[PDB]
Amino acid sequence: PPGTVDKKMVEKCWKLMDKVVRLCQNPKLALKNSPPYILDLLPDTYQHLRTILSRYEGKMETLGENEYFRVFMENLMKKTKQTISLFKEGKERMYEENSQPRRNLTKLSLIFSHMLAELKGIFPSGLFQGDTFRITKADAAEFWRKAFGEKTIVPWKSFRQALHEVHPISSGLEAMALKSTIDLTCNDYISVFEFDIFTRLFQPWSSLLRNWNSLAVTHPGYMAFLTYDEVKARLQKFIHKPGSYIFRLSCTRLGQWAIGYVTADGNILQTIPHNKPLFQALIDGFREGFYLFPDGRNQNPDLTG
């Protein structure tokens, strides 16, 4: 594990978020004001940590001893530092849309949003609930508790091994694929929260990895760490090709899918499917004319089986 968190540890990141914020208030950035919005996420995080801190009144060093939280505070300083190092080591090219240091900022924005979700799900009301966490899918629940008990968080390697025993992982490159599908906070730890989001998105547990294989590894329409505005912008190029669609993880309704597609009246709509697995949304969308050409490609995966 990583070091003790004291009160002086937290003043550190508060100062670092401050520097991130002021850096993000640059007119030149022309920072769209929509989820994930770094300029809210950061204040909200601090806000939530005040909450956690104000509740660990006095016993402020039972908290200092929390593993998950010690990992979190670490990652947090880490991520905020990276971010600061982009504005430095990337100088001017922050400012062209579709440039490295600017997509990386979106990625970072994204991770930041995953962090706050993870935290809030582990500390609802600001008071630790990691080990009493309800996992959503019956069968995923079974696996986790029967492999990690009431642990909130494991290291990646640990998780990989455990998973492999039940759902073998074809290869090292695949493992690596999986690792960045599931490590939403990019911390080389898998948390119970992280695990639930993956297991919801890729049900039934029974065929978990086969599912993930068909919907993400081998699927032209899957998009990785992509935001809503990014989906609108990407599908611009197919505006004259209705049926063109992509899809991704919803950022605000974490654990759910967000399909984006071009209509015959020529707008670009986005839905969160409900009460169907993703498989069937996509099959029906094909069958019904709405989801025909993934990311523009004429060729569309057969999933009926």
Partner: peptide, 5 residues
């Protein structure tokens, strides 16, 4: 987000 097609 908007209703499924």
């Amino acid at each position: 987000y908007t209703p499924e097609p």
